[PDB]
């Protein structure tokens, strides 16, 4: 396990935000800034995506295990680590969105 | 630019020779687990099991004692005690049935206002949550552990017309529905209302009074011109279409709205693009992707199987090589990626399943 289960995920949903500020480090007319801001969205999106589906992969694991006190503990930290990354990656974006445009 | 490639490794044509409407892998399964998927059409579930050098053994074989029903749409749950798997099919008759894979026995039955079910979709987090789309203004969601209806979406601000399609969000906070009225409508499931009532039907026993839901969170009408027919969530992404040969990828609000931030007023929406195909215009054609949300597919109505890299930002440059099969000339209703991504399966209206192995 149940340990390796939350710390595999806590791990993959962390590779998930760092290749995505990487992602958005490789990253002007107003048409053309509307262009790489749809470029950050898209990229953003597919960082939420990862984390979510890692989460639900974690879920599944841990319900596919069946304590019962240690394994609704494992999915309640697991939907915290999920909220904890997307406000991560909502807030990178919600930074270079604004970096292009100043 | 997409990468992906697929062969064609096996094909059969199911004995009843009736139109395949619907089909299904079971994700609810571990690495190294067989891989399982169901298939809907006429008054027959039929389970498949997929096997090395394309072999494709059939498991089991449901036939349903009313001989007038005609399965359109299945999905797959697990039983919250067991973890068996369970299989929920409906169609022409209204009739929501829980099957018991191991037994291939109806253990459980659900009747919404009567009018046959266009769409079956299960709750991402909740097991026992299943959000029913019929032929009515209306969209049901139930909760299968206490045989209860959790609540109706629709009335007031509801779909106009007939509700034909919706899905959840990856964590089943929010429900995407769209209908014959043109329109995709946001309905929020993790507000305080919502959650209450599903933690009250929870607490039922006998060893009930549903929530009506007249209003939206988001209405849009500017997407399509014509009947949405099928709508998915891409993240906080939307992606929908019509008869008009596209799949529409879009957003609520402007470019750079949080999705969890719009206004129910919210009057903008933003689209992203459109993946273009042909020959794909006639009524109930579905399109679908693999867990990882990496992949898109959709069959047409001659047989072609179209595929595209969602990793693509451009739809344009997102599409890959078209699947086809010189013997494959029967409209595609339903495909399905297996767990892995490394199966896709297409069922036509001959009654023929094609499967496609990724090679790439």
């Known amino acids: ?102 | 630019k997409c990468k992906y490639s697929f062969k064609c490794v096996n094909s059969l044509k199911e004995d009843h020779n009736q139109p395949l409407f619907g089909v299904q892998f079971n994700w609810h399964s571990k690495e190294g687990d067989p891989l399982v998927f169901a298939t809907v059409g006429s008054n027959r579930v039929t389970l498949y099991e997929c096997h090395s050098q394309g072999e494709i053994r059939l498991l089991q074989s449901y036939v349903d004692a009313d001989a007038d029903e005609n399965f359109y749409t299945c999905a797959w749950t697990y039983d919250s005690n067991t973890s068996h798997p369970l299989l929920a099919v409906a169609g022409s008759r209204g009739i929501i049935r829980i099957i018991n894979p191991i037994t291939m026995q109806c253990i459980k039955h659900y009747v919404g206002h009567g009018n046959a079910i266009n769409e079956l979709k299960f709750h991402p987090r909740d097991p026992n949550l299943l959000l029913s789309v019929s032929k009515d203004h209306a969209l049901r969601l139930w909760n299968i552990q206490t045989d209860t209806l959790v609540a109706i979406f629709g009335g007031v601000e509801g779909h106009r017309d007939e509700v034909l399609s919706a899905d959840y969000d990856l964590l089943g906070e929010k429900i995407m529905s769209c209908g014959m009225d043109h329109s995709l409508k946001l309905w929020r499931i993790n507000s305080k209302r919502m959650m209450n009532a599903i933690k009250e039907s929870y607490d039922y026993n006998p060893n009930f009074i549903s929530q009506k839901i007249h209003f939206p969170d988001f209405s849009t009408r500017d997407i399509h011109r014509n009947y949405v027919d099928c709508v998915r969530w891409l993240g906080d992404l939307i992606l929908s279409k019509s008869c008009e040969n596209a799949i529409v990828c879009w957003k609520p609000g402007k470019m750079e709205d949080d999705i969890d931030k719009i206004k129910p007023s919210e009057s903008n929406v933003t689209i992203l693009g459109r993946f273009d195909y042909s020959q794909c215009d006639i009524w109930y054609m579905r399109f679908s992707m693999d867990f990882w949300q990496k992949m898109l597919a959709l069959g047409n109505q001659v047989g072609k199987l179209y595929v595209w890299d969602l990793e693509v930002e451009d739809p344009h440059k997102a599409k890959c090589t078209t699947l086809t099969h010189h013997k494959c000339g029967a409209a595609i209703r339903q495909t399905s990626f297996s767990r892995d991504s490394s199966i896709l399966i297409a069922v036509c209206d001959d009654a023929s399943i094609w499967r496609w192995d990724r090679l790439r």
């Open chain 1, 1 to 102: 396990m149940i340990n390796e289960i939350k710390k595999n995920a806590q791990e993959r949903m962390d590779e998930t935000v760092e290749q995505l500020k990487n992602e958005l480090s490789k990253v002007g007319t107003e048409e053309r800034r509307l262009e790489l801001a749809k470029q950050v969205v898209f990229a953003a999106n597919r960082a939420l995506i990862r984390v979510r589906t890692i989460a639900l992969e974690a879920a599944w694991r841990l319900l596919m295990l069946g304590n019962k006190r240690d394994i609704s503990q494992a999915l309640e930290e697991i939907e915290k680590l999920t909220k904890v990354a997307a406000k991560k990656i909502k807030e990178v974006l919600e930074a270079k969105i604004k970096e292009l445009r100043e």
